[PDB]
Design a protein around this ligand. Structure first.
Ligand SMILES: Nc1ncnc2c1ncn2[C@@H]1O[C@H](COP(=O)(O)OP(=O)(O)OC[C@@H]2C[C@@H](O)CN2)[C@@H](O)[C@H]1O
Length: 506
């Protein structure tokens, strides 16, 4: 045999149908809202609040390109320079390189534009190139230069240990991302920077470097988005929430029972996870290498739903106890392949319903696993506890009862690029979801043996009525008996065989 095992997917909970009704949208101490809630209507472009541009240039807010404090030593206005540079007509790729470098002179040797030049000159056909420089690029410039009429309210940084939300319009995000494309955000470039060293890259200069064969596919994917959002203004909202928990369960003592499992070797988190909490296998610097050379699970999601990318403008590097939750991003592209075989396939028309805040009914959580360079390192209790607490923070929704929480749509978190063991991580996610009172929908991404192994272990543990704490104690025993005093690189016996023996022996 079967393509899926466990509980039928029809019997799992989904949004917004399992959704609480939303409370009224309102600005508060822990929620920044950048549009007029009183004027928010389905099918209408949201109105910025406030009506006129207000600037903050300080250690707690985004440094906007259009700030009067964005100055260049000649002090002149850098925003005036950006406007003059970008309002020239482009007919050849050198023109675009030269424009970006007019307000980035310190990087005129360091930033390579080979990928941009090759895309324009050596990938596109003539009519496609013409469309790019006659239509798409000038439309992008115009939405970028409208920034102070669109993003009128200062955007707070979602800094370390903040529990805070930002809700902004898809139109505001389009203007911001056009700016990132033209690399206009100040103080976000120097490799020896201080203020923003703990923030991800936002400006898109590394998208334009080198000769990776995947750069044309990343550019096709982003130009699909920019072509659609400059042609017809998008009408919905997107919320970005930083969440930080203080109190974690005492896992060894947790008496909660396991929840339900559906596990399948067909399908993906993004297509088969509708109405479910969709996991992003993140970097602690959210978005990973999306605007540089990365092209695995996180980067692909950030390309096909590009509104995710703007999280990099204001989300500080995640600590152990933190996650980011993004609600309302839209899917603009379809893809084939993965990593070095990734291709843009076509435009996607998102058919998601919107909630009462005009957000697409798509909820994504970024949780970063640890990057293990040795196999045995992940079985150390400290490290197991770390992964449990991370996943718990991602799954937990303080205030909300269990019957209003959708299933988690997840899979082989930490077990590709980050070197984790899928059988351990599967159990870690099962326990975290149990403590958060959510069911699990687990995609094994073509591994049919792994599907049968996860199913068999879950139903073994469930039938014996083992608690979260019972299971965690078995993890601690595997560590003590097979890993702690182990000389060799791999242990003598595997986790699942150990568990079956320990329980059946008792
Ligand atoms: N779309 C997908 N749906 C379900 N599973 C997927 C999907 N895409 C990839 N996978 C599976 O998930 C595994 C792990 O994906 P990776 O992206 O390598 O994740 P992980 O090891 O946590 O690496 C984290 C870093 C940090 C990110 O910025 C970039 N990659 C892959 O080896 C596949 O088996």
């Amino acid at each position: 045999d079967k393509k899926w095992l466990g509980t039928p997917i029809e019997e799992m909970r989904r949004m917004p149908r399992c959704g609480i009704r939303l409370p009224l949208l309102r600005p508060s101490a822990n929620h920044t809202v950048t549009i007029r809630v009183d004027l928010l209507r389905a099918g209408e472009v949201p109105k910025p609040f406030p009506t006129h541009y207000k600037d903050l240039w300080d250690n707690k807010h985004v440094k906007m390109p259009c700030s009067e404090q964005n100055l260049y030593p000649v002090a002149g206005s850098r925003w005036e320079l950006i406007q003059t540079a970008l309002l020239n007509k482009f007919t050849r790729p050198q023109n675009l390189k030269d424009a970006i470098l007019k307000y980035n002179v310190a990087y005129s040797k360091k930033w390579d534009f080979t990928a941009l030049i090759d895309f324009w000159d050596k990938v596109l056909e003539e009519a496609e190139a013409q469309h790019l420089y006659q239509s798409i690029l000038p439309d992008m410039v115009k939405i970028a230069l409208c920034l102070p009429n669109i993003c009128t309210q200062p955007i707070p940084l979602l800094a370390a240990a903040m529990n805070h939300s930002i809700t902004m319009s898809q139109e505001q995000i389009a203007s911001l991302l056009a700016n990132a494309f033209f690399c206009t955000f100040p103080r976000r470039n120097a490799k020896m920077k201080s203020e923003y060293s703990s923030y991800p890259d936002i400006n898109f200069n590394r998208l334009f470097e080198g000769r990776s064969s995947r750069k044309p596919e990343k550019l096709k994917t982003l130009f699909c988005y920019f072509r659609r959002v400059t042609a017809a203004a998008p009408t919905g909202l997107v919320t970005f929430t930083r969440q930080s928990l203080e109190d974690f369960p005492e896992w060894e003592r947790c008496e909660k029972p396991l929840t339900r499992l559906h596990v399948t070797y067909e399908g993906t988190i993004e297509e088969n996870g509708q109405g479910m909490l969709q996991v992003d296998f993140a970097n602690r610097f959210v978005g990973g290498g999306v605007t540089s050379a990365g092209l695995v699970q996180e980067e692909i999601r950030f390309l096909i739903n590009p509104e995710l990318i703007i999280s990099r403008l204001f989300t500080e590097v995640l600590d152990h106890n933190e996650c980011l939750i993004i609600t309302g991003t839209e899917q603009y592209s379809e893809y084939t392949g993965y990593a070095e075989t990734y291709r843009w396939s076509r435009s996607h028309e998102d058919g998601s319903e919107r909630d009462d805040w005009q957000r697409r009914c798509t909820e994504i959580v970024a949780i970063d696993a640890l990057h293990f360079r040795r196999y045995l390192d992940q079985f150390v209790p400290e490290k197991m506890r770390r992964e449990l607490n991370k996943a718990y923070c991602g799954f937990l929704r303080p205030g909300v009862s269990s019957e209003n929480l959708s299933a988690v749509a997840t899979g082989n978190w930490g077990c590709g690029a980050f070197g984790g063991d899928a059988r351990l991580k599967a159990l870690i996610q099962i326990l975290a979801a149990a403590a958060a009172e959510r069911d699990v929908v687990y995609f094994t991404f073509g591994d049919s043996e792994l599907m049968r192994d996860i199913y068999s272990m879950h139903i073994f543990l469930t039938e014996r009525k083992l608690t979260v704490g019972d299971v965690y104690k078995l993890l601690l025993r595997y560590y003590n008996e097979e890993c702690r005093n182990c000389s060799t690189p791999g242990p003598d016996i595997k986790l699942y065989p150990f568990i079956y023996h320990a329980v059946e022996s008792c």
